[PDB]
Amino acid sequence: SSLPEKDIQYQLHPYTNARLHQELGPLIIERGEGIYVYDDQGKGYIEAMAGLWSAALGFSNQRLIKAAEQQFNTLPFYHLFSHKSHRPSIELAEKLIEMAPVPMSKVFFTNSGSEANDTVVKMVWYLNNALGKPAKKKFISRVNGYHGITVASASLTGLPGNQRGFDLPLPGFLHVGCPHHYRFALAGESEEHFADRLAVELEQKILAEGPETIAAFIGEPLMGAGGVIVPPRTYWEKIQKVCRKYDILVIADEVICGFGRTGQMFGSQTFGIQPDIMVLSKQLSSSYQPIAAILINAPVFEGIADQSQALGALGHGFTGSGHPVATAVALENLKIIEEESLVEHAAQMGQLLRSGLQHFIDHPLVGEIRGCGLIAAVELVGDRVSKAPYQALGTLGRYMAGRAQEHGMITRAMGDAVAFCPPLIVNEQEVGMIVERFARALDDTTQWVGPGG
Amino acid sequence: SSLPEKDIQYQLHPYTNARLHQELGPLIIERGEGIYVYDDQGKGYIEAMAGLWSAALGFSNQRLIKAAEQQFNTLPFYHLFSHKSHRPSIELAEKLIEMAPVPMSKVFFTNSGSEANDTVVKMVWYLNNALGKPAKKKFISRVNGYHGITVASASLTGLPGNQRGFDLPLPGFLHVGCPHHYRFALAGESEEHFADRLAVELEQKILAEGPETIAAFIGEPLMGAGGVIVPPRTYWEKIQKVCRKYDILVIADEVICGFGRTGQMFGSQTFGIQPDIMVLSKQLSSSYQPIAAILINAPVFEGIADQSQALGALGHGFTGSGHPVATAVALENLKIIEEESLVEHAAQMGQLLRSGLQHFIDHPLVGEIRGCGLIAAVELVGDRVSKAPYQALGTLGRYMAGRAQEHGMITRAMGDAVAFCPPLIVNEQEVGMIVERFARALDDTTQWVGP
Incomplete structure (x- = not known):
């Protein structure tokens, strides 16, 4: 019995579709260090959510x-x-x-x-x-x-x-x-x-x-x-x-x-x-x-x-x-x-984060970029005038979060918004990497949708 | 300034009379080892409740x-x-x-x-x-x-x-x-x-x-x-x-x-x-x-x-x-x-506990002794025939629990019953000490209630 098989057999997961979980199984996180976590295949991710909005000092x-x-x-x-x-x-x-x-x-x-x-x-x-x-x-x-x-x-x-x-x-x-x-x-x-x-x-x-x-x-x-x-x-x-x-x-x-x-x-x-x-x-x-x-x-x-x-x-x-x-x-x-002095540091990192995201403010799928300090979200939309979703509400956020993960970053979708809440100890280069990975996920999403216009 | 003063100034305690707490302050527990905890004056207590019915393996x-x-x-x-x-x-x-x-x-x-x-x-x-x-x-x-x-x-x-x-x-x-x-x-x-x-x-x-x-x-x-x-x-x-x-x-x-x-x-x-x-x-x-x-x-x-x-x-x-x-x-x-093999060990220690407590079954303030395995209680009463409390329900249990603490044992009153739920790792002589400290508290309580 493998570890994923045991997970599927024995655990009822919070905030999870239990039937879908039986098909797909877990993403098993094995270890953490600094702002990163690593899955059981050795792949690393920036934990841009600090786990659950919470790991102020990172994972080690x-x-x-x-x-x-x-x-x-x-x-x-x-x-x-x-x-x-x-x-x-x-x-x-x-x-x-x-x-x-x-x-x-x-x-x-x-x-x-x-x-x-x-x-x-x-x-x-x-x-x-x-x-x-x-x-x-x-x-x-x-x-x-x-x-x-x-x-x-x-x-x-x-x-x-x-x-x-x-x-x-x-x-x-x-x-x-x-x-x-x-x-x-x-x-x-x-x-x-x-x-x-x-x-x-x-x-x-x-x-x-x-x-x-x-x-x-x-x-x-x-x-x-x-x-x-x-x-x-x-x-x-x-x-x-x-x-x-x-x-x-x-x-x-x-x-x-x-x-x-x-x-x-x-x-x-x-x-x-x-x-x-x-x-x-x-x-x-x-x-x-x-x-x-x-x-x-x-x-x-x-x-x-x-x-x-x-x-x-x-x-x-x-x-x-x-x-x-x-x-x-x-x-x-x-x-x-x-x-x-992490309150002050987080404030400075948050300005870098928000400035990095705002390069995409006139993107056809970007409805709103919001936040303050070191918390932010980008709300994606299918149409900026109407603010309507692409396909069902949540489609863009789910696709974006999946692409971010592929590009080595864990974010969280809230409908069609993707959130950022990194550890307070994040440094300037790491903020740059967070925004880079967001950008790649956005590029992927944009190619997937094909906005035209 | 002092640690008890800080506690009074800043903490709202569960299951505590907050006004009485402002007067008396806390009993500050500093460290634990085995079945014992120690207050900040260095006094040791058998934690006969395993903290809150919980410290199966003791405190170290x-x-x-x-x-x-x-x-x-x-x-x-x-x-x-x-x-x-x-x-x-x-x-x-x-x-x-x-x-x-x-x-x-x-x-x-x-x-x-x-x-x-x-x-x-x-x-x-x-x-x-x-x-x-x-x-x-x-x-x-x-x-x-x-x-x-x-x-x-x-x-x-x-x-x-x-x-x-x-x-x-x-x-x-x-x-x-x-x-x-x-x-x-x-x-x-x-x-x-x-x-x-x-x-x-x-x-x-x-x-x-x-x-x-x-x-x-x-x-x-x-x-x-x-x-x-x-x-x-x-x-x-x-x-x-x-x-x-x-x-x-x-x-x-x-x-x-x-x-x-x-x-x-x-x-x-x-x-x-x-x-x-x-x-x-x-x-x-x-x-x-x-x-x-x-x-x-x-x-x-x-x-x-x-x-x-x-x-x-x-x-x-x-x-x-x-x-x-x-x-x-x-x-x-x-x-x-x-x-x-702590399930089996706890069962054996529980027999010792219950047999030790049963020596007090004819005591005039003991209304009932109950339990099984390694959990037990002794319910005190003011009168065994009527099963009535002394003064009011809880008066005996509060006094008993306090006396147990003075004799180096932490128990918990549940109305007029005092509880025993020691760590599973408790040994035979430690069960004996638990019963002895219960007995001393009971003697004190008997003298207190008086003729």
């Missing part, structure tokens, strides 16, 4: 590996229940709070972004019960947002692919419009006027539902899995005014944006968000360990704390919450990002 | 540590999305399927037991939609069961502490009785007749709700966090007959029971369960890494697979699903449990 950072070792040999597992604690969770929590872009009070740890957003839902319900506001429970999120895939966090999520077949969303998880100007603005509408319309939509939704029933608004500062969607100018300012008007919590989902992805340490800085709660994951540990973190501000903590007293203890926690190895690795990861 | 297993190192230096992160794969996930999935106590088809990986049960809920809904049974969506679980703490998995959970203040359970998550003879049987009622009554309760619940609306029954073979509750003889046989009668899936939650805790490899073996789906966590990796696993049988896989095709791809997965370091560590962990 020895400092993270040694940090894990040192903690394993000290205390390889312990927990935070019932007053227990340990040094790595404490020092990581301190670091996270002290680096927060707004004043924050406490950290709560989980294993995943999905668990973290699920926990935030529970914390907000618990809070409003503590405050004597039992009706104030509904969440508002956006179409095409991604907040994870637990029953509750997939309800926050606004991507149909995460809901169809799963009886989601649950009641009380409401969705307003995707802030993507290219796709949803009216003809000849400015970004600012589009933002106005989105803010009016939110306020009208709040009023229709009863403001006293709305607890929280959650958003990624820019939307990752939904297409690297940069909101229109003035969106976050105007959205936050509406939320404050009705005493609605603002939750910044920084799972992808966190730790230097967008040109500053947090997407909340880049986009001028003053959140009550922040959710972090991914680059927190360069995904070397499963760890996520919730930052809550003082009012959120104080209400939760009061109720935890009245009810004996806070009846929530994962076994792995604050896992000492995962926290030790994350702590060392953040130190490296600071010591090596 | 070098093989697990080296397995992590070797994988870190090969490929420290990758994922399973969009046909991608890697060796440690593949080899672990193979091992899990081949060791399953009933024929299983596929493994799906998550980070936690809560995520795994949450995923199972979604899988069952997805399956029944695929099969053209859109009404067949309700879950039945038990009072005092523990299945995790996501919005959905806390709804499966049957412990009030996990639901009060959280607006749970969600609709469609139904609960039948806790199978605890000491608390819920009638006067003079046999275990077998108590089991009959519980099976009738389940069937009547199914009929009242409409059998066509019930998708699944989920249970821990024995209930862990809810009190180390061993079901009455014939319970699982009779419960399963009811489930099969109405085409209801049987889900065995082996998060605590898995990998030698109950005297055999799985609680499903110990209790004669033939589940459609199994959920594993904890001892899977000795908790050295966050990893859990779902095993699904052929019919479940085939329906999900068909739907994943019709809908383009299976729209579910965690970044950490099958993480190469976590899967590598789990794989090595299972190899060690096999190579060192």
Whole structure:
């Protein structure tokens, strides 16, 4: 039995067509180094997605590996229940709070972004019960947002692919419009006027539902899995005014944006968000360990704390919450990002990336080139005036991603957009190679389509 | 400034009174070795809970540590999305399927037991939609069961502490009785007749709700966090007959029971369960890494697979699903449990534990001693005839657990019961010390409650 045969026989893959998988089998990745991964045939690829938007320090950072070792040999597992604690969770929590872009009070740890957003839902319900506001429970999120895939966090999520077949969303998880100007603005509408319309939509939704029933608004500062969607100018300012008007919590989902992805340490800085709660994951540990973190501000903590007293203890926690190895690795990861000035470096690399892509801005299949900092997408279209796809929506993105792989680069298609989210440690020459490989994949796609004109 | 001060300033603790925490601060655990952990003052404790029912190989297993190192230096992160794969996930999935106590088809990986049960809920809904049974969506679980703490998995959970203040359970998550003879049987009622009554309760619940609306029954073979509750003889046989009668899936939650805790490899073996789906966590990796696993049988896989095709791809997965370091560590962990015959060793140590505890069966505050394999609990009461608590439920258990800690043993109170779930590697004298530290805590508690 070969390794691919075993994979097909035994594993149900996430985000995979299981029948197609039985026919094609896996692409088995064997090893990683720097920004590269290598398959089991020895072929190398630039991991232009940093795996899953996550491997900030690349695939062979020895400092993270040694940090894990040192903690394993000290205390390889312990927990935070019932007053227990340990040094790595404490020092990581301190670091996270002290680096927060707004004043924050406490950290709560989980294993995943999905668990973290699920926990935030529970914390907000618990809070409003503590405050004597039992009706104030509904969440508002956006179409095409991604907040994870637990029953509750997939309800926050606004991507149909995460809901169809799963009886989601649950009641009380409401969705307003995707802030993507290219796709949803009216003809000849400015970004600012589009933002106005989105803010009016939110306020009208709040009023229709009863403001006293709305607890929280959650958003990624820019939307990752939904297409690297940069909101229109003035969106976050105007959205936050509406939320404050009705005493609605603002939750910044920084799972992808966190730790230097967008040109500053947090997407909340880049986009001028003053959140009550922040959710972090991914680059927190360069995904070397499963760890996520919730930052809550003082009012959120104080209400939760009061109720935890009245009810004996806070009846929530994962076994792995604050896992000492995962926290030790994350702590060392953040130190490296600071010591090596990787936020600034990623900003400079992101300008090179975007400039490289913009050579193709008048290409007949290039509908939009978007991004900021070191995250970007190229949305391909079959017709630039109508913005219509070539053949079915997704055809171009799938073909492009396949060609990129052939040319030694792993990208991710989101419909007809192809994403870039390379490790922060990418250098100038490597950005050049990423754009070169994009260009070759685009040339292949263009020859395949034959645009004429 | 100090480490405890930092902890108070910056961390919101699970399962903690946050205000009391601001006054008392943490007990900071600095290091571990074997079955012991040490606080930052150098005091050693027997970790009689194996941390959180989980550290099968104890706190200094070098093989697990080296397995992590070797994988870190090969490929420290990758994922399973969009046909991608890697060796440690593949080899672990193979091992899990081949060791399953009933024929299983596929493994799906998550980070936690809560995520795994949450995923199972979604899988069952997805399956029944695929099969053209859109009404067949309700879950039945038990009072005092523990299945995790996501919005959905806390709804499966049957412990009030996990639901009060959280607006749970969600609709469609139904609960039948806790199978605890000491608390819920009638006067003079046999275990077998108590089991009959519980099976009738389940069937009547199914009929009242409409059998066509019930998708699944989920249970821990024995209930862990809810009190180390061993079901009455014939319970699982009779419960399963009811489930099969109405085409209801049987889900065995082996998060605590898995990998030698109950005297055999799985609680499903110990209790004669033939589940459609199994959920594993904890001892899977000795908790050295966050990893859990779902095993699904052929019919479940085939329906999900068909739907994943019709809908383009299976729209579910965690970044950490099958993480190469976590899967590598789990794989090595299972190899060690096999190579060192730890299932058999744990069973022998469990007999010693239970025989040691049984010396206290006539103590005036001991209401019940229960367990099997290497999991046990002693339930304290203020009065043995009435089974009433001292003051209020939980007062004794809180005091006992605190005294155990003073005597160098970490236990966990579940109401007025204190639990034992030591690492599988515990030795005979260490079991003796566990019982001795229990006895000292019990003496203290007796003097405290007083005449």
